[PDB]
Design a protein around this ligand. Structure first.
Ligand SMILES: [Ca+2]
Ligand SMILES: [Ca+2]
Lengths: 130, 130
């Protein structure tokens, strides 16, 4: 428990989810992440992920300026997963931003704190908010 | 000419552009906007669009808080268009955000100032920046 916590993570990829792309489960999403990675579309970018009781914020690790923010009302799902062929956990966040026609899948690689700890924190903040 | 100007607009829709969706031209995009609208996916939301010499910013018309921002380096195209069956101009902005796997199309309805005036301002700011 902490109202505001931060974690350093590496953002790996954000991609839109359409009703006809065949991507329906966390597992389908991890598989599309591995395809993307084999096409040279995934490049790790270090970021600061901040969970507060009203939103999840992403910041530049040095400048501390806000790169993106998702109010908790915009998060539709948060999971942590270890795809086949990886010793690590990925943090998956699906958001439906109000202005966008489709939801997006965001994948993050956790560093020392893993994705499981961040998943519990966001899910605790979601339960609370909701 | 003005380094920073603002315009009130209505955001209509933002959607991702994929290499296999058949959407290649401004005209294809206006047609997909009309399909979306006939599926009940388009709802006008009033916003403040600000052009500065380093970025395009979208704000809530009252609270003035930033809703989104696109550094000029992220804009790949800006056009104004009058689709068939409309007496008005739409402002089209295509952006490729660094973190996203695909570019997005954003459509805005201009109000009293039209989309043509905003297109020239962003294109002037793009030329300058570039
Ligand atoms: Ca917490
Ligand atoms: Ca200007």
């Amino acid at each position: 428990m902490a109202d505001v916590s931060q974690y350093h993570v590496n953002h790996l990829v954000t991609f839109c989810l359409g009703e006809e792309d065949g991507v329906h489960t966390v597992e389908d999403a991890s598989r599309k992440l591995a395809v993307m990675d084999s096409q040279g579309r995934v490049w790790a970018q270090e970021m600061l992920l901040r969970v507060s009781p009203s939103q999840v914020t992403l910041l530049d690790p040095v400048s501390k300026e806000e790169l993106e923010s998702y109010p908790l009302d915009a998060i539709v799902r948060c999971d942590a997963v270890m795809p086949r062929g990886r010793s690590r956990s990925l943090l998956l966040l699906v958001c439906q931003e109000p202005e966008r026609a489709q939801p997006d899948v965001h994948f993050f690689q956790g560093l020392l704190l893993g994705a499981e700890l961040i998943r519990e924190d966001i899910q605790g903040a979601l339960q609370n908010y909701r």
